[PDB]
Each structure stands twice: as structure tokens, then as C-alpha cells.
Symmetry: C7
Amino acid sequence: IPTVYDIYSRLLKDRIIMLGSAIDDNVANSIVSQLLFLAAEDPEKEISLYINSPGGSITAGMAIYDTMQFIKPKVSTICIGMAASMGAFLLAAGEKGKRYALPNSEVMIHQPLGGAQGQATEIEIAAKRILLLRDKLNKVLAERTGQPLEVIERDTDRDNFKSAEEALEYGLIDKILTHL
Amino acid sequence: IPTVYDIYSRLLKDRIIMLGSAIDDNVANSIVSQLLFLAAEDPEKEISLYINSPGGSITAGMAIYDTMQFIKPKVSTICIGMAASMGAFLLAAGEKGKRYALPNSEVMIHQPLGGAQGQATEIEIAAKRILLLRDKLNKVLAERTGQPLEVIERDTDRDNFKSAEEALEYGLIDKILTHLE
Amino acid sequence: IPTVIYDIYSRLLKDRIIMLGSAIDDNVANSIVSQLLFLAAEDPEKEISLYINSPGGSITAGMAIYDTMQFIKPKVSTICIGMAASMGAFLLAAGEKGKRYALPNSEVMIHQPLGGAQGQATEIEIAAKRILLLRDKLNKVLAERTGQPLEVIERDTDRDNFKSAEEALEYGLIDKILTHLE
Amino acid sequence: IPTVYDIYSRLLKDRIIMLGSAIDDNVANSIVSQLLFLAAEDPEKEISLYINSPGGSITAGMAIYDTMQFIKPKVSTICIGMAASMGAFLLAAGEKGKRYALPNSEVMIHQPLGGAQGQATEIEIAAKRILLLRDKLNKVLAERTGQPLEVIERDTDRDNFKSAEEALEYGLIDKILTHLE
Amino acid sequence: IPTVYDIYSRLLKDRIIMLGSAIDDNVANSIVSQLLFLAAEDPEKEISLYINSPGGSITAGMAIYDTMQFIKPKVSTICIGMAASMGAFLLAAGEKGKRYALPNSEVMIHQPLGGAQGQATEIEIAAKRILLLRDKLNKVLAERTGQPLEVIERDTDRDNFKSAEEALEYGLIDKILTHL
Amino acid sequence: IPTVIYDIYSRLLKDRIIMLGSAIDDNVANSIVSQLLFLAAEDPEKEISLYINSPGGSITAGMAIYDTMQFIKPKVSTICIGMAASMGAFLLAAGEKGKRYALPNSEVMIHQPLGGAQGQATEIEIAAKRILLLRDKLNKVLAERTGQPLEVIERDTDRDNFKSAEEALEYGLIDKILTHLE
Amino acid sequence: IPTVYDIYSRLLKDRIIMLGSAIDDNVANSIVSQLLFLAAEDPEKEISLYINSPGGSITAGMAIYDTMQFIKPKVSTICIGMAASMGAFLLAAGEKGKRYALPNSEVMIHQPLGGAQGQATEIEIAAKRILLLRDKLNKVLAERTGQPLEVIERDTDRDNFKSAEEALEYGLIDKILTHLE
């Protein structure tokens, strides 16, 4: 980032948030803070969230997600480059009707990844958790896309890569931008 | 973090503290300092503490906890994303009636983790300590939630994960926010 | 990066010039896209110049830049200075047709995508199928930008293909080889 | 931390010093510098030193200690979270009558830790030193607490963990907070 | 570096660029940017490029080189301390007649270094490349020095170290400064 | 290091106070010497105070400080706060005779030089000869500063020698033990 | 390095350059830049270069050296603490008559260090180079000191450590200071 004053900061002035990295507790905390701030400046005006991320932590993602739905402003999402795992999720969380993607953008969805370690009990505790998480997310996706849960389930069994059009068709995005 | 003033700093101007990392001596020291500062600016106005943390050091946590109860202002807590171990604890420490959580927030509670090393004596010294710590915390939770000690004890024997509603039911939060203002 | 005259790269951005002099990854892409978006907001009418000296990078990170370039109103002129390979070469070719330059000793290299699979037969197939489409997708874009028929681009990028400024001009990657600015 | 003026710095403006880390030559040097600075701004006004530290170097600690007793201002200490080894020591060094601690604060005291390496002679040189150090410190504690040396000696043979009340009873703190004002 | 407002920056104010490190994509990018900037401030005034470098990437070097020949201003070069590989090259790229070097400066030239790895084909692809690179550079040197290609070729077979005078004689520099 | 107007240590320098609270190496010496030189340029008349809490350091780095102290016009007062060993102790003793203080529980340790040789017999001899002279050189300086006869300093620094504030006062390292700042 | 404006920078304002580290391409580049800058501000006024360095790269050194002789201003050198290898060299490069050193300063000179690796040819290429370098430097030293080349050669065969006086006698410095101003 070129200190022209942060570049990303000047862009925030026009109500634009840039997510171009993996999603972890830290990134989430920043983006959530940006969202909260924008909502305080003008809870009326729209917000744009560009997304080019490989995914990240399930919780960190939901923090962003909920924050988006929580604030008054409508958050428009634009998948630029690539949006997978939570990244894809967040793209779909954008205000229905304002979820865009560029021509060669790419989108990928899949079931949750995790790990258990310890006693049988402990592992069960973790397996039960992740499974609910999977179920919780799939349901959210169903609403955002329109696909029936059954589909989302079978479709995210393994890495599912989709093109912008394929993404439009599935119900992840609403339109493919070409000129600004 | 952006500089459009430090972002987290501008948010502090509206009396909002952001905890989005593990809790250690350092983080505790920062948040306590923020709380103390806010209390000096206007000991009358409310304070909001967003929480998305995996937990941390028992002592570092209590430092925050006590500081919250100590200052005049009422600290409102909002679990955003995830609050476990001390994180969950702090969420519950928020002014009764103003402890919120978002729809897909998640909350986990459990007994303390630690380690002993050395002579039998030394290990006993540590085992006796941690056990009291566990007991001390559990009692605090009982008050904050309303659950009887017995329950908190049995319920935190091993990692206990709860949804926002499950959290509301247990007495950790008071309401699940969905719309702002 | 010398502090004053404040980032030098920043002062250069003031004259609407973006410098890409490193590999291309999610991070770099994010910065450059941000610069492009910013410039388009300042004056969607004026031209933009993107100097390029990069070894290539992530396919996605690249397309992000690519699409952003085609997306914004301003016309993005590209100048291969030193070296432009993989996505780097690609981006050079994405510059507004007619304003894609390269200096005398610039060098340009193109090739098919690199990647890796790991896991069950299924998983590997999933990856092989993906990369292959990616290759195909990119090759098509190149055909348009260069004028070469897909067939050529395919056979020509089977293995690292190094080209000189002239060879690059001939292939249709650049339009002119700059020599001075008086 | 957050820059809204560094936060720890703004807090120093109200004459408050934050010790929330282990104590080493470096930390000591910073805190001593802060103390000296505050004494130059107004040698009349009180100073507050919040403490949440695991302890540290015996010398680094004494530097702070002496500096506290040296300057004109009276240094009030507040154990927030946890104060052990030198940390505990410093808490006890606070101006008698103004050594506080919050509800769930925790305090631990113990004899010195060290190491020798080399020739018999060299080890003896080190053993003789540390032993005097132990003795020197114990005496200081006796004065600050009121306990007779005999007690301090036997009581710090091995890690001794105390609760806020237990700490009040021993004579380490004077009062336990709860509500500011 | 110390503040004067950076020191290397204040020196840039008098139109002086300092190259005192190896040459890599990054360094090249910085220096090229400095050159472009200076050319925008006053395409009429001269520019001075002090050089004390062990060499670097062939491409990173050429980027600098071409940029020097490309801009309107004349770039004067001064080898201070040591200039080898590309470093030497850049010294020779300075505006003919204004390529200086201090008394105990030292200059070294040599053929390109690189590496191949993989299938016979792949290695051939790399060998063919580097060889052309060598040839390309040698030709550039011939022009800048005046030496016939034949000489440059045989002379750079292995590390060739030259003193300021030896450098003057070869045609790399034009004069050895004593006290400006 | 809390920046507040501005870095704590800097504001303290404004009142002519230098803080040495770390080991002594080429770097630290360079900073402290620079501070001393600066203070001497601001007012070569006014006194300077050098607080010391250091484990010691490089013999040369130390002497650099030492000489600089004796070199400048201002009189440098030293205060051992916490601990002063090896060069640290040395520097404390270098303070203007009469203004070398120490707090109640300060501690001071002195000892002969530490080093290492490596290589040919010759090379090792070169190093052994050097360090020995260094030891001798320093001991002499200490004799003057303390008042103790060389013989004593020699025998007394054969192995780590730890001294209390009083023991330090008695030896002649400090002049008075402070109790009030005033 | 305390920000008063930075100490080293304020010192540069009075035309003083501080070299207190090993000498490498980077340090050389900085010091050269400082020298060039000072020469632009007032090519008439003298410049002082304090030196406390263990030595460094032969080329990095020469860059400084030549730059010193190149600029109009006369560069006065002061060995403070220690000056070895190139460091010693630079001390000797100071304007004859203004090369000082403090009482306990120390100065060490020696022949060049390096390394070869590869084919016989390659090694010869390097051996031939370093040898010329040694010869080149020795000659410079002869001029600066007054000693005949033969002496410098034999005298730097192996690490040669000299005291301030020994340094004065050899012709490296001109006077040993003892009172500034």
C-alpha cells in the first residue's frame, strides 16, 4: 500500500471496503470496524465491499456477515478475482440485488475444514460442532441463493469451482459488471 | 488496520472498544487502559465492548473484568463472531441487561487450562491454585448467568459450545441484536 | 521507497502512474486494483499508465487486475519495462489496444499455468479439471489481445516461451517499442 | 495500542503508569523514566501505578522500587489482574495507605530464582549473592507488610498464592476497590 | 538513514539518485520511479546516479538502463566504491562524456549467471535464453565502451576486475574525478 | 517507550538527563555519546545526569562513553539505579568526583574483562596480550577514580565481586547514597 | 536513537557525522550521502566524522574515503572508542592535522580478509584481486601515515593493536584531545 495517507483509507472515504486476503480473527476485526464506522458516518448511504479472498475462519467470517446484516446501510458486494469458502459466503451476503462480479471473477464453495485432537470425547465434541456449523452455513446459503438445502449440501461435499456465469446461475451473484 | 486517525481509534471516540484477538497480559493492558480513559472522559456515558476472542490468560481476563465493574460507566458487551474461555466470561460481565450478541454469534465456556512442572510439592502448589481459580470463576459465572454453581461446574467440565439462542437461554446474553440505530 | 518529494511511488501515482515491480499475489493485486479504482474516481476521463516488470504470479490475482483494467472508464496504457512473464505478460497485453508499449531491451515470456493437486483421486481430478479450464480461459483472452488464433497460443505456451521486444511486437503483445519522451 | 496520542501516553498525562508485562532491565528503565518525568512535572501530585505482572529481574525491580521511594510524589499502587515476584514487591512498595487491589486480583510471593555456572568458587560467589538478595528483599517485605522476618522467610520458601483478601490480611495491600470515585 | 525529511530524499531534491545495494526487481522499481519522477520535474536538467553495487538481476538492470536512455534528461553516472555485473553496466550507460569514477573506485564485468532445472527441454529453453542475454548485453557494452564485440566476449569469460584507470582505458568511464 | 508530547526518554533529555538501561554495545555507546555531545553543545556550562542500570557490555563501547564524559565541558553526574556491573560500574565511577550517587538498594559489581581467541597460536597470543593490557588499562583508571591502590583493584576483580550501595560507597565507587530527590 | 527530530540528525545540523557500527554497502551509502549533503549546504565549513567501528567491506570503506577526499570541505576525524580495519583507514583519511582521538581510544590495522570458491581459475581471479587490494590500501596508508610501504606491509601481516599514543606515533592521528572547545 502506497502512503499517498493510506491508499485503502482514501477508498474508504468513498465508502468502499477492500477484502483481499485470507479471513482471520484479525481481518474480520478490521472489516467489522470499517463497517461499523461507515454506518456511523451515514446510516443511509450504500457501502461497497470488494472481495478477492481464498476464504478463512468460519467464525471470523460470520462476524463480518452478521455485521453486514446488522448495520442499517445496504452492503453491495463485488467479487473481483476470486471468492472462496467464507469469501464466497460474504459475496452472497451482499444486499440481494447488488451482489456483482467481474467477467473473469471466479467463485468456489465447499464444506468446512477443521481438526480434532485428544480423547474420544473431545473429538466427538468437535465433530458435533463442525457438523452443526456446516448445517448452519448451508441453510444461510440456501436463503441467499434460493437453492434448496438438499442441493447446497450435495454441491459442497467437495470443492466446487464456478465461473461468473455459473455463479450467476446458482444465485450467488445478481449481475456481472463490465463497465463501471 | 486503516488510517481514515487510526480506525480502531476513531471508533474509540464514539466510546467503543474492539477486542478481536486472544487475551494476554498485553491485550488486557491495552483494553484496561482504554476503559480507564473512557471513564475519565465522561464517567456518565455508556461504553460498548465488541467481543470476538478465542479466550486467553485467566489473570489477563480478570484484569479486564474487574476494570469493567470498577469504573462508573456501564459496559455493554456484544459478542460478534465468537467468544470463548475468558472471552465468553467478559461477555457475561457486561452490564446486566446490555449484553448482546448477533444472530450467528457463537459462545463457548470451559474449565481452566494450565501446567505444572517440577517437584511433587511444586505441582501440588499449582494444582491447588488452578482449582481455586476454577472455583472462583465458576462462582462469578453463576452470578452473571443465574445458573446454580452445580450446573456451571458440570457444564464446563469439557468444551461446551453454545449458539446465540442457547447462550441467551443459559443467561450469558440478554438479547440477540439484528437491527441497529 | 524514499520518504519525501511521502512515497515516491505515491508521488508518481499523482501523475496517474502505477508501478508493478514484483511478483503478483493476492496482496499486490489488491493494492494495484485499489490504485486503479482510485484513479478512476479522480478523473474517469484521463488515461492511466501501468509500468510492468514482474515475473508473473497467481492466476486469480492477475485476472483481478485484468478485469479491473477493462472495468474502469479510463484507458490503461501498459509499458513492459525490464521483464513481463506469466500474468505479467498477460497484463501487458490487457493494456488499451494501441497503447501497449515496451522499452528496447524489455523481455516478455508467456506459458501455460502452474499448479498442484493433493489428496484423493477425486480431489486431484477436481483440480486438474479446474486448471485446464483456466488455461483454456486465459489462452482465449490472449488470442483476442494478440490476434493469434487459439491454436497458436496453445502450442506456443506449452513450455516457457521467451520473446524479445520485437518478437513481442510481432506476436501482437505490444503495439510499439518506445525510445524516448522529449 | 490504539493511537487516540498513544493511549498509554494519554493515560500518563493523568499521572498513571501501566505495568503489564514481565519486569526486565528494559521495562524498568521505561517505568523509572516515567516516574522521574512525573516528579518533574509536579513533585506535589500523587502518582498511580497499575500492576499486572508475572515478576521479573530482582535488580530491574529494585530500580523501580528505589525510584518510587526516592521521588517526592507518593506512588499509589493498584494490583489489577496479577502481581507476582517483583510485581508483588512493587505493589507493596506503594505509599502505605494507598496500595489497592481489585476484587479478583491475585498476588503471589516467593524466594528468588537464579543460576550458577562454572568453578566451585564461581558458584559459591553466586550462591552467596542470591542468598543476601533473598535476605535483603525479605527484610523490605517485613517492613512493608508488618509481618516478622521469620514469617516472610518461611512463607516464601515456595510459591505462595494469595487472593485479594488474603493479600489484605497479610499486609500487602490496604483496601480492595470495587467502586471508583 | 537520518532525517534532514529523509536524507536520500533530500539528495533527490538536488537531482541525485543513490544506488548502494544489489540490484533486484525491487531496487530497480525504486530507481526507475525516481528517474521517471525527476524527468517530470524538469526534463531539461541533468541527473546524477551514484553507483556502488555488486550487481544483480539482468532484467532489473535493463529496466534501469532503458529508463535512463528513455527519459529526456541526461543521466550522469559516478562509480563510488564498487560497480560490478549490472552495476558496471549501468555505470557505462551514463551519458557518454559524463561517466565518472573516484580515485579508488573499482569496476568488474563478467558474463551472466543463472540456473536451469527440469527436463532436457526445459534446460535447453533456459540455456538458449541466457546465451542470448549474454550476447545482447555484450553488444550493448561494445557500443558504450568502443571495444569490439570479440574483445568484450573474451574479456568477460570470467570475473574481470579493473581499477579506475583500467576502467578509463577500457572505455567504461570518461574521467576520474579528484575534487569537484 | 510511550510517545507523549514525543518519546519519554527524549523529554527527560530536555532536562539534561541520559538514561542507560541496557547492556552496553557499539550501538548503545553511539547513542549515549551522541546525547552527551548534543547536551554539551546546548549549554557547555550546565551539569548532566546519567542514570545507570546496566549489566555491562563491550570494553571499547564503554570507554567511548567514558572518554566522551571526561572530554565534554559539562560535569557528568552518575546515579546507579538498580544495578551497575562491568563497564556499567566503570561508567558510574567515571562520574564527576563528588556527584556519583546511588540509591539505597542499588547494587554494583566489578570484575576482570571477558573475551575469546580463536585460531593459530600466534593469533591467540595477539589476543591474550591485548586483553591483558586492556585489563591493566582499566584497573589503573579504577584506581584513580576509587582511590584504591592498583594492587587492590587487581586482586579484588579476579572474580565477580558484588557490592551493596554502602560497600560501594566504602570502596570509593560512589560518593553519596541518595534518599530524597529535591 | 531518541526522537528529539532524531539525535543523530540534530547532530548532523552542526555538521557532525557519527559512524558507530560495522561498515557495509548500506552504512557507506548513508555516510556518503551525509557527506554529499553537508558539502552542498556550505562547501566552505569543516566537517567532523566521529569513528567507533570494527571495520567492514573494503569497497564500502573506499566509497567513504574517496567521498571525503572528493568534497570541498575538510573532514576532521575523531576515533572515539575503537577504529579497526577500514575504520582505522577512514580515521587516517581525515584532513591531515585534524585527525584526533580520545585518551583511551584504540586503533587496529590489518591486511584484508576474503574468500574464494570454485575452480582453480576462479580462485586465482580472487587471490589476484585481494592481493592488489591489499597493495592498493597499504600505499594509501603509507601516504597518510608517512611510514614507508615496507613497514605498513610487515606491520599489518596480522592484527596490530595500537593505543592512542602508539597511534599518534605511527602517524594515524595528529593529536589526542582532552577538552572540547
